[PDB]
Amino acid sequence: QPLNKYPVVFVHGFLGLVGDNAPALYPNYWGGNKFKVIEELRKQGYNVHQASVSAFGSNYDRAVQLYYYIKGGRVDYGAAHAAKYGHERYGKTYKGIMPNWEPGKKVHLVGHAMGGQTIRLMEEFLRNGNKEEIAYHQAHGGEISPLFTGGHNNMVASITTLATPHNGSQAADKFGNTEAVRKIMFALNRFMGNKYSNIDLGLTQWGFKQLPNESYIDYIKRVSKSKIWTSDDNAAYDLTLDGSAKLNNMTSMNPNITYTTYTGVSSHTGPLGYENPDLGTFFLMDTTSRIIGHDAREEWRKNDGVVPVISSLHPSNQPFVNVTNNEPATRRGIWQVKPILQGWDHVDFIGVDFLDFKRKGSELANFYIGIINDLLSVEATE
Amino acid sequence: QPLNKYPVVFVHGFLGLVGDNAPALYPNYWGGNKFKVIEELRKQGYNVHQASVSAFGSNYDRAVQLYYYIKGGRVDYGAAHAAKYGHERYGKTYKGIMPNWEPGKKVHLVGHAMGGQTIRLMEEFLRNGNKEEIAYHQAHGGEISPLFTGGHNNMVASITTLATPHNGSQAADKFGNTEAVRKIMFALNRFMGNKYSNIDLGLTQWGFKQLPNESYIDYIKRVSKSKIWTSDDNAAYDLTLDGSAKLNNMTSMNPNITYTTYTGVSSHTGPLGYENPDLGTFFLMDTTSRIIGHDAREEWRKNDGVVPVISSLHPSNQPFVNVTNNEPATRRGIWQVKPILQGWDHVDFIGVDFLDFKRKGSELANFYIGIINDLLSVEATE
Numbered sequence: 001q002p003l004n005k006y007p008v009v010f011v012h013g014f015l016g017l018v019g020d021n022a023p024a025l026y027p028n029y030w031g032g033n034k035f036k037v038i039e040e041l042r043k044q045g046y047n048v049h050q051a052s053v054s055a056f057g058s059n060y061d062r063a064v065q066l067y068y069y070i071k072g073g074r075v076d077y078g079a080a081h082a083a084k085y086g087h088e089r090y091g092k093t094y095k096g097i098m099p100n101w102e103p104g105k106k107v108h109l110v111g112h113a114m115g116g117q118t119i120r121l122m123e124e125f126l127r128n129g130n131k132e133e134i135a136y137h138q139a140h141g142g143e144i145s146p147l148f149t150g151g152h153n154n155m156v157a158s159i160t161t162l163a164t165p166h167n168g169s170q171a172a173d174k175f176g177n178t179e180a181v182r183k184i185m186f187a188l189n190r191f192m193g194n195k196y197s198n199i200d201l202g203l204t205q206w207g208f209k210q211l212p213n214e215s216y217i218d219y220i221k222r223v224s225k226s227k228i229w230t231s232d233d234n235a236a237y238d239l240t241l242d243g244s245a246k247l248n249n250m251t252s253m254n255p256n257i258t259y260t261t262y263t264g265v266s267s268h269t270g271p272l273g274y275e276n277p278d279l280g281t282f283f284l285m286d287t288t289s290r291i292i293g294h295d296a297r298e299e300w301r302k303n304d305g306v307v308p309v310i311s312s313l314h315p316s317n318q319p320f321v322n323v324t325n326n327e328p329a330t331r332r333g334i335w336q337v338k339p340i341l342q343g344w345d346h347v348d349f350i351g352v353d354f355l356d357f358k359r360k361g362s363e364l365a366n367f368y369i370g371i372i373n374d375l376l377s378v379e380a381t382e
Numbered sequence: 383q384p385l386n387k388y389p390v391v392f393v394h395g396f397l398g399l400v401g402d403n404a405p406a407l408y409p410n411y412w413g414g415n416k417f418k419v420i421e422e423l424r425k426q427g428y429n430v431h432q433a434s435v436s437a438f439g440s441n442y443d444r445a446v447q448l449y450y451y452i453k454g455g456r457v458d459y460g461a462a463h464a465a466k467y468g469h470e471r472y473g474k475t476y477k478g479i480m481p482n483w484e485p486g487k488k489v490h491l492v493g494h495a496m497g498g499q500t501i502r503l504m505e506e507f508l509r510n511g512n513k514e515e516i517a518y519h520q521a522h523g524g525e526i527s528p529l530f531t532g533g534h535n536n537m538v539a540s541i542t543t544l545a546t547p548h549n550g551s552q553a554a555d556k557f558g559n560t561e562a563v564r565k566i567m568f569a570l571n572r573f574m575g576n577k578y579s580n581i582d583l584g585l586t587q588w589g590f591k592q593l594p595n596e597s598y599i600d601y602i603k604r605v606s607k608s609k610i611w612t613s614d615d616n617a618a619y620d621l622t623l624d625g626s627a628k629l630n631n632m633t634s635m636n637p638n639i640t641y642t643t644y645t646g647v648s649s650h651t652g653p654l655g656y657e658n659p660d661l662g663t664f665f666l667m668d669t670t671s672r673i674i675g676h677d678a679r680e681e682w683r684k685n686d687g688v689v690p691v692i693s694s695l696h697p698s699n700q701p702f703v704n705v706t707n708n709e710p711a712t713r714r715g716i717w718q719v720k721p722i723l724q725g726w727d728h729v730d731f732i733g734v735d736f737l738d739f740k741r742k743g744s745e746l747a748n749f750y751i752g753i754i755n756d757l758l759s760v761e762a763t764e
C-alpha cells in the first residue's frame with residue numbers, strides 16, 4: 001500500500017511536544033502551519049509518524065523511549081542506569097507503532113535538532129547494547145530489555161538529521177545548562193506534573209507527577225529531594241559541547257545505514273568577524289545566536305540561531321562526505337553532508353517561524369518531499 | 383522652568399492603555415522599550431504628559447474625556463448626547479493636569495492614530511461648542527459643560543497627528559466595524575468590567591462595570607440590554623471611511639493653530655499594482671495591510687499596516703501644504719504635511735514593534751525631539 005516500504009519516523013528535539021501531548025494552544029511541531037508534514041505526506045501515500053519522547057530528558061532517556069514508541073511496551077531505562085542516576089527504572093507504556101519491529105523490518109529515522117542525537121543513541125543500543133546493563137544483569141540476574149542486549153541489526157535503514165547539534169552548542173554551555181536556567185526548566189516540569197495536568201514534559205521518571213491526594217506543598221517537598229536538580233542525565237547537559245562529545249565518543253558508523261545531515265545558517269558576519277542573527281531569525285533565538293556568534297573560536301561562530309554550523313554538519317571525527325543537492329545521497333556508512341541552507345534558522349526546518357515570510361510553505365513542502373525522495377532512493381538501492 | 387512654555391499632551395489612539403490603567407504585562411504605549419517618550423523628554427527639561435482616555439469609545443466620548451483629563455473634573459458627555467445614544471451622562475473624574483487651563487494658557491496636542499481625530503474634535507468643541515447640547519440646555523435648563531458652550535479660543539497652540547486615519551481606514555469598514563468583531567470587542571469590555579478588574583477599557587458609561595454583589599450571570603443579562611451593541615457611538619464606527627468623513631464635515635481649521643501631520647508607509651507594490659505589507663510590518667497588521675492594499679481604488683492602497691497613506695496625510699476636505707523636513711513647521715491654519723516615513727508602520731511611530739530591528743531607539747528619539755523642536759518654534763513665532 002504505502003509508497004515507502006519502510007515507515008518514516010520523525011523525531012522531535014529538545015522542548016518539542018507533539019500530538020495529544022501538546023498544550024491546548026501550541027505550534028504544530030512538524031511543519032507549523034506552513035507544511036503539515038505528517039498529514040500531507042500521508043495524503044500523498046507515504047507511511048510516516050511523529051515520535052513522542054521526553055522533551056527535557058537526556059538522549060539516553062529519549063533513545064529508550066524512542067525504542068518503545070516504535071516497538072510498543074513499558075519503557076525500561078535499565079536497572080544500572082536507574083540506580084546510577086537516581087530515577088525510576090520504568091516509565092510510560094507505549095502502544096507501539098510497529099509491534100513487529102525486528103531484524104528485517106526496517107524504519108527510516110529523521111531527527112530534528114536533538115532528535116538527531118537521540119536516533120544515533122538508539123541505533124547504538126540496538127547494535128551494541130548497553131554494557132553497564134549487560135554487566136548488571138550478568139552480576140545480579142533479573143530481566144534485561146532487548147534494547148540493551150545488542151545484536152539487533154537490519155532495523156534502521158537511514159538516519160537523517162536536521163540542524164542537529166552533533167557537537168553540542170554554546171547556547172547550552174553558556175545558557176541552557178547554567179544553574180539558573182536548569183532551575184527554571186525543572187520548575188516548569190514540576191508544575192506541569194501537577195494533578196490537573198494533561199501534558200508530559202518528559203521528566204516524570206524523576207518524581208515530577210503529583211499524586212491525586214498529595215497537596216502541592218507536599219509535592220514540592222517530595223520532588224526537591226530528587227536527583228534531577230544536580231544530575232547530568234538531562235537534555236541541557238547533553239546539548240553542551242562536552243555532553244555531545246561523550247555521545248560522539250560512544251557511537252560508531254553502521255555500514256548498512258544511509259546517513260545524511262542538513263544544516264542552516266541564519267547569521268551574518270560583522271566588521272570584527274563576529275556573527276549576528278539575520279533579520280528573520282525567529283526572535284526567541286536572538287540572544288542565543290549572539291552568544292554563539294561571539295565565540296573566541298571563529299569556526300564555532302556561524303549558526304542557525306541556537307546551533308553552530310560546525311555542530312550540525314556531522315559528528316566531529318566521524319567519516320563524512322560533502323554532497324550536492326542534486327546527486328543521489330545513497331552512500332552507506334558515511335555522513336552525507338547536504339549544502340548549508342542559507343537563511344534557514346533552527347526552527348525554519350520545522351516551519352514554525354510564523355514571523356518569517358521569506359520561508360514559504362511550498363519551499364518547506366519541497367524540502368520534506370526531497371527527504372522522502374532520498375529515502376525512496378535508499379530503498380531502491382538495497 | 384520647563385523649556386516649553388506650553389505643556390505637551392500626547393493622546394493615544396484606539397486600543398491604547400497608559401500608565402496605571404495598563405494590564406499587568408502590556409507595552410509602554412509612548413515609545414515601547416525603544417524610547418521612553420514621557421520619561422526621556424522630561425529628563426531633557428520638557429513638560430510633557432500622556433493623556434488617558436477611552437480605548438474603545440467614540441471620538442466624541444474620548445474628546446470629552448481629553449478635556450477633563452487636562453482641565454480636571456467629572457466627565458460630562460452632555461445630556462443630549464447621553465439621551466440620544468443611551469449611555470450615562472457622567473463618567474470618571476480626573477484630577478486634571480492643568481486646572482488653570484483657560485484662554486491664554488495654551489497646550490500643545492499630539493495624537494497618535496485615533497488620538498489625532500480626538501484632538502481635532504475636542505478643539506472643535508472648545509471653539510464652536512456643541513449645538514445640540516446648547517439647544518438642550520436652552521430647552522431644559524440644568525448645567526452645561528464649559529466644553530460645549532463655544533467661544534473658547536487661544537487654548538490650543540498646535541495639533542500634530544501621527545498616522546491618524548483622518549479619512550478612515552478600510553480595515554475598520556471591512557473588519558473592525560463588522561458585527562462579528564464589534565461583538566468580540568464589547569465582550570472584552572464586558573469581561574474587563576468584572577468586579578475584580580483594575581483596568582478600564584473605556585466603555586463603562588455603557589454599563590460595563592459589574593457591581594460588587596452582582597453575579598456574572600446577572601451582569602451578562604443586564605449589559606445585554608445596553609445600546610452599545612448596536613450603536614455607532616464607538617471607535618470602530620468612527621474609524622470607518624464614513625465615520626471619519628462625518629468628523630471632517632463638522633470640523634474646521636482654526637487660523638491660530640499650527641497643524642502638522644506625519645504618515646508612514648510599510649507596504650510595497652506587487653506586479654498587479656496591489657500593495658502588500660513589508661517584512662517588518664508588525665505581524666498583527668499583516669491581514670489589515672493586505673485588505674487596504676487590495677483596494678479597488680489605487681490611491682487607497684499604500685498603507686502603514688492599518689491606515690492608508692491618503693487617510694493619514696490630511697483630512698480630505700481641509701487645506702494642506704506639503705512641507706519639507708527642514709522647513710520650520712510654523713504656518714498656522716493649514717495642515718503641514720511632513721514627508722512620509724519610509725518603512726514606518728502604524729506602531730513604529732510609538733516604538734512598540736519589538737520585532738523590527740530596523741527601527742531603532744535612536745531614530746525614534748530623533749523623531750520625538752524633532753516634534754518638540756517644531757513645538758518650540760511654534761512658541762517662538764507667536
Ligand SMILES: CCCCCCCCCCC/C=C\CCCCC(=O)O
Pocket residue numbers: 012013014015016112113114115165169171172175176181185239306307347
Ligand atoms: C529553555 C532553554 C533553551 C536552551 C537552548 C540550548 C541549545 C539548544 C540546541 C538545540 C536543542 C534541540 C532541539 C531544538 C528543538 C526546537 C523545537 C522548538 O523550537 O519548539
Ligand SMILES: CCCCCCCCCCC/C=C\CCCCC(=O)O
Pocket residue numbers: 394395396397398494495496497547551553554557558563567621670688689729
Ligand atoms: C480589534 C480590531 C482592530 C481593527 C483595526 C481598525 C482600524 C484602525 C485604524 C487606526 C486605529 C487608531 C488608533 C490606532 C492605535 C494603535 C495602538 C496599538 O496598537 O497599541
Ligand SMILES: CCCCCCCCCCCC(=O)O
Pocket residue numbers: 187188190191
Ligand atoms: C510565565 C512564567 C510565570 C512565572 C512564575 C514563576 C514561578 C517559579 C517556580 C514555580 C514552581 C512551581 O509552580 O512548582
Ligand SMILES: CCCCCCCCCCCC(=O)O
Pocket residue numbers: 569570572573
Ligand atoms: C483570549 C481568550 C479567548 C477566549 C474566547 C472566549 C470568550 C467568549 C466571550 C466571553 C465574554 C465574557 O466572558 O464576558
Ligand SMILES: CCCCCCCC(=O)O
Pocket residue numbers: 025026027
Ligand atoms: C491565530 C492564532 C491565535 C493565537 C493563539 C495561539 C497561541 C500560541 O501561539 O501558542
Ligand SMILES: CCCCCCCC(=O)O
Pocket residue numbers: 215216
Ligand atoms: C488555583 C488552584 C485551584 C485548584 C486546587 C485544587 C485543590 C486540591 O489540590 O485539593
Ligand SMILES: CCCCCCCC(=O)O
Pocket residue numbers: 397398399405437574583
Ligand atoms: C487578563 C487581562 C486582559 C487584557 C486586556 C487587554 C486590553 C486591550 O487589548 O487594549
Ligand SMILES: CCCCCCCC(=O)O
Pocket residue numbers: 597598
Ligand atoms: C472563576 C474564579 C474566580 C471567581 C470569583 C467569584 C466571586 C463571586 O462571584 O462572588
Ligand SMILES: CCCCCC(=O)O
Pocket residue numbers: 015016017023055192201
Ligand atoms: C503550559 C505550557 C508548557 C510549555 C512547555 C514547552 O515549552 O515545551
Ligand SMILES: CCCCCC(=O)O
Pocket residue numbers: 405406407408409
Ligand atoms: C496585548 C497584551 C495583553 C496581555 C495582558 C496580560 O497578560 O496582562
Ligand SMILES: CCCCCC(=O)O
Pocket residue numbers: 576577578592596597598
Ligand atoms: C462575578 C464573579 C466572577 C467574575 C470575576 C472573574 O471572572 O475573574
Ligand SMILES: CCCCCC(=O)O
Pocket residue numbers: 666667669670
Ligand atoms: C489588529 C489585530 C487583528 C488580528 C489579525 C490576524 O491575526 O490575522
Ligand SMILES: [Ca+2]
Pocket residue numbers: 280281282343344345348353356359
Ligand atoms: Ca526564520
Ligand SMILES: [Ca+2]
Pocket residue numbers: 662663664725726727730735738741
Ligand atoms: Ca515595523
Ligand SMILES: [Cl-]
Pocket residue numbers: 101102146152
Ligand atoms: Cl527487538
Ligand SMILES: [Cl-]
Pocket residue numbers: 192193194197198199200201209
Ligand atoms: Cl503529567
